[PDB]
């Protein structure tokens, strides 16, 4: 008993169903990640960009007081910088996928500038490192170590 045949894309395309679910077909990994980034930007671009902004430690700079506590938390914990460090330690192939994903987000914003919330445009363009930064913040400084448990709030 063997799995059915794996499909083999001949062109890069996203097939969306009636619920807004993206089916990303790429001729290679980078293409798939690029499409995934594009799709995500189109479906949740505003919040993704804002989140990437926070992961840079620039939440306070971009949006003010309500984002300052997180900025102090990420800066004091060296998150933005470690993100750069982790980004540099990625394997070549995976860095390409991360870069393609980031390029996907930028391309979408580039092609549809009117769909990007105004207060979030200042974050563009995002980079592979921003992608790593957000994942690092989510995993280690939101799930594992929360500001509440340290600050005792």
């Amino acid at each position: 008993q063997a799995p059915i045949a794996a499909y083999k894309p001949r062109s890069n395309e996203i097939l969306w169903d009636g619920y807004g679910v993206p089916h990303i077909y790429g001729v290679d990994a980078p293409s798939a990640f690029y499409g995934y980034g594009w799709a995500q930007a189109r479906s949740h671009g505003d919040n993704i960009l804002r989140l990437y902004g926070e992961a840079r430690g620039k939440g306070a700079e971009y949006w003010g007081p309500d984002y300052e506590q997180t900025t102090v938390w990420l800066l004091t914990n060296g998150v933005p910088e470690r993100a750069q460090q982790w980004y540099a330690q990625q394997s070549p192939d995976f860095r390409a996928n991360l870069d393609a994903f980031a390029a996907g987000i930028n391309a979408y914003a580039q092609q549809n500038p009117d769909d990007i919330s105004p207060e979030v445009r200042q974050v563009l363009p995002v980079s592979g490192a921003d992608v790593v930064a957000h994942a690092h913040r989510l995993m280690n400084f939101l799930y594992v170590a929360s500001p509440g448990r340290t600050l005792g709030e």
Binding site: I14, N77, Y143
Partner: protein, 522 residues
Amino acid sequence: SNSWAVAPGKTANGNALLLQNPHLSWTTDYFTYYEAHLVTPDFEIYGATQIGLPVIRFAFNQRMGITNTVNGMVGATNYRLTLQDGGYLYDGQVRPFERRQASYRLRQADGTTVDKPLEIRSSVHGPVFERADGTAVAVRVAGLDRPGMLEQYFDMITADSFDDYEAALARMQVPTFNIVYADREGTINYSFNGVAPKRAEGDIAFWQGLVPGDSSRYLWTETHPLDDLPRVTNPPGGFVQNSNDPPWTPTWPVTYTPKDFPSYLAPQTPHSLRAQQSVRLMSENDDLTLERFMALQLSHRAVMADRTLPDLIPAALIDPDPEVQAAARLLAAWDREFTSDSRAALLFEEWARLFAGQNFAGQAGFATPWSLDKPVSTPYGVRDPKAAVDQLRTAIANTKRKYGAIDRPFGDASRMILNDVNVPGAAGYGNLGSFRVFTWSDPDENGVRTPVHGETWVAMIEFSTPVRAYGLMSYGNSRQPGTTHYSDQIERVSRADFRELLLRREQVEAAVQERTPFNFKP
């Protein structure tokens, strides 16, 4: 979050079953799940993941799939520092802080910015903070030298065999989460994953509070490898599960006990009633089909009612107040299910809020305490029926204040409202026993409450050939302003009408509504 993996032997067709059922806030931006499908000449992955993440955490394809649930791996330690002579006391001597002057901009209301200085200090433990009460705390986070979290998930959900999956999981780049796996060859696995520091003393509770920051005796450095953590593969029971409960009953019968691991890896606290339902729903059912597997997921039993009503009702019936007697008779007639038409459910929650606390996790009111020896049938009974009856008296008042009557239909107050879609709710609080979760909010001025957290991405997969899967996303697949894909799935959720997840080319082509050809110019 819930997670089920069923071995072939426990199914009717001989194919493993998998349930992806993460529970998260319906509003917190970074907790928003997004559904996607990625196909390449070398791999395929379908599933949900938090927005911003370039890899799918809840993935599956024609060959395998995984799911996650929070296990709360204690991968960080907060130390109470003893400040002295410009440094901190460590092993009797004063050490200097590593000090770094930084600066950051803070946007003003008018759009301009001002520069604010920020001094970043570190003890030997890690970055230093100061609480509102003045306590000086240093946070030490494990795995700050694990840059491959995203690639590990990529290699996990894209593994060609269980051995590849394990080898990838074994890298220890994913710092937390319980992870369940199932594939078409028949393997099911449960892993209490995460980067846990090796400690020479202290149980989990000790390492969760402020640890003394004045001694190297508590400065850990090494972390545990995969083979040191609780894991189960193709257990005798034919299933693996986890509903956020400690890893002590991931399957039935169990394959290990607390004493088999360091006391600091996981808590040994009472399993929630939802986690107990999880174990029962799997162990008590055999010859499962995907349809039956899916029906069991909708379980919404008011388990705490089974553990308390037999004692509460008689005690309430003796109270002279005809309203208390009326509430007792209402509760007694109830089938103890959180169905839309339940007229007793709301009142029961209100009583439970007092009996077991606002989060329904309290244990002090039970007559028979929880015991790992009877993990799915304890705690039980009402310790003080008389006091419990007073709590009911108050609950009756609270039910009227919140909903307008002691017998308002559950589904008339419990609503799922997204944009212009407004539909009846069902199921509820996990700590009350409901497997399918909908953490209802406090009601508005008219007694209408909606989900704050709960069912989000829900998917059930049968690893047949080809695979067959069904799913639903409570809050749609898009949250951009004006999108039509935010509230277009909630109506289906209210009827438990899952959509078939399309992985095969012809299926996708038959369903295409929009096409986005693209050119990736590196």
